[PDB]
Design a protein around this ligand. Structure first.
Ligand SMILES: [Ca+2]
Ligand SMILES: [Ca+2]
Ligand SMILES: [Ca+2]
Ligand SMILES: [Ca+2]
Ligand SMILES: [Ca+2]
Lengths: 417, 6
């Protein structure tokens, strides 16, 4: 949750004071748990600003050897009021890095799972439904916090929060909010199930998920999929797919890719670049199993260098080589997999653009990406999108969607660029 | 809340 280093700071009271404002206490807890004392503001040109060691957000542990643990707000203030002009502080510097730093949606600081579950009830129970309030909460909260809100709402109402919103919402907005409530593994599992449900597979969605997920994510998806649907994901893929496209998807969904080692294996990088060339462009036909094993077994950093070393031997790069060697679902899968290896944020930027560029909106693609990447690499996606397409992802969502559905997507986007 | 100046 937090990274912590502690520092002793000695300050000389200026006439304005020590030059900072404190918050906290047992009677005014800054968050739901900590009763500590925190620096909420550092006055410009104050004794603490000039000293430069104190930071906004630090926790005051002790003042002149007196601990500030479990004190009322007034008891903490009174310790400063009687401290004299030479004040010795012991502070705790805090860095809030957790999850990913490239995610649009972060954990809400003043989080209270009970009040949110309460306020979502109010909204469901208001006449006409306050969707805006449902959206303002659930899109501003981490996926873990949404799980807490789902737990509280069940205990208070004896109904599952998702089943309640499933009745209080409709259309595209319902799809977004219901997606946000599932865990990452549950959402991917159900999205995978929906693409294979029915004779006739949505290979587009199946490729996107299976190609873009890491070993850690696929291992979890495999566990949750079997819990939810009483069958193995690998078995459902074998049933809905065939040919070398089946081989590729089965190997990828296993999530047994080599982990990034500390040592870069330049010798293997060159051999794999030679193999990929021998199996495809250099020969008549294509040794597809050789392509599958290299591109599914080797680690992502390794394969990034393999694709560049491949350009030393082949007159075409990997993507052009795939378009010249295979067709159909197999070609689609290789092209997606290589893009995920080379630049996954750009891959999602391109799929976002394709879901909105022309007539209408491929809402199923737009929604899944905004949901499943909002806490992973959405800020990198927006950076690649802005760099390539000139306008922001915010702007394209704004032009393709409307209403509270747009607002939710704009929140999951996280802002303009 | 209650920012208190010290
Ligand atoms: Ca309404
Ligand atoms: Ca409905
Ligand atoms: Ca060939
Ligand atoms: Ca082709
Ligand atoms: Ca459009």
């Amino acid at each position: 949750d937090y990274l912590v280093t502690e520092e002793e700071i000695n300050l000389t009271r200026g006439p304005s004071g020590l030059g900072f404002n404190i918050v906290g206490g047992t009677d005014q807890q800054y968050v739901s748990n900590d009763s500590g004392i925190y620096v909420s503001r550092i006055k410009e040109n104050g004794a603490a600003a000039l000293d430069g060691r104190l930071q906004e957000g630090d926790k005051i542990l002790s003042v002149n050897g007196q601990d500030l643990k479990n004190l009322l707000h007034q008891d903490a203030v009174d310790l400063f009021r009687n401290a004299g002009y030479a004040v010795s502080l012991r502070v705790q510097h805090r860095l809030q890095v957790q999850g990913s730093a490239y995610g649009s949606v972060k954990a809400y600081t003043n989080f209270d799972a009970e009040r949110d579950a309460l306020n979502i009830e109010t909204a469901i129970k208001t006449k006409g439904v306050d969707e805006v309030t449902i959206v303002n909460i659930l899109t501003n909260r981490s996926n873990e916090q949404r799980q807490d809100i789902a737990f509280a709402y069940q205990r208070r109402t004896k109904k599952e929060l998702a089943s309640a919103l499933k009745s209080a919402l409709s259309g595209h907005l319902e799809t977004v909010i219901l997606g946000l409530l599932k865990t990452p593994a549950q959402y991917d599992a159900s999205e995978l199930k929906a693409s294979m449900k029915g004779l006739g597979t949505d290979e587009d969605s199946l490729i996107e998920i299976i190609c873009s997920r890491t070993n850690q994510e696929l291992q979890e998806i495999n566990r949750v999929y079997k819990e939810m649907y009483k069958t193995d994901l690998e078995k459902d893929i074998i049933s809905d797919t065939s040919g070398d496209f089946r081989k590729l998807m089965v190997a990828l969904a296993k999530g047994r890719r080599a982990e990034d080692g500390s040592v870069i294996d330049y010798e293997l990088i060159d051999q794999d670049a030679r193999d990929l060339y021998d199996a495809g462009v250099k020969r008549k036909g294509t040794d597809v199993p050789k392509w599958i094993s290299i591109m599914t077994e080797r680690s992502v950093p390794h394969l990034q260098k393999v694709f560049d070393r491949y350009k030393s031997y082949s007159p075409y790069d990997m993507l052009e080589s795939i378009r010249k060697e295979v067709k159909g679902d197999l070609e689609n899968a290789f092209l997606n997999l290589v893009q995920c290896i080379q630049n996954k944020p750009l891959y999602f930027a391109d799929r976002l653009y394709d879901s909105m560029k022309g007539k209408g909106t491929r809402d199923k693609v737009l929604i899944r990406i905004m949901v499943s990447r909002s806490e992973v690499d959405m800020l990198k996606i927006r950076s690649e999108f802005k760099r390539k397409y000139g306008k922001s992802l915010y702007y394209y969502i704004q032009q393709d969607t409307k209403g509270d559905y747009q607002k939710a997507l704009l929140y999951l986007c996280g802002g303009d660029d | 809340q209650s920012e208190t100046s010290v």
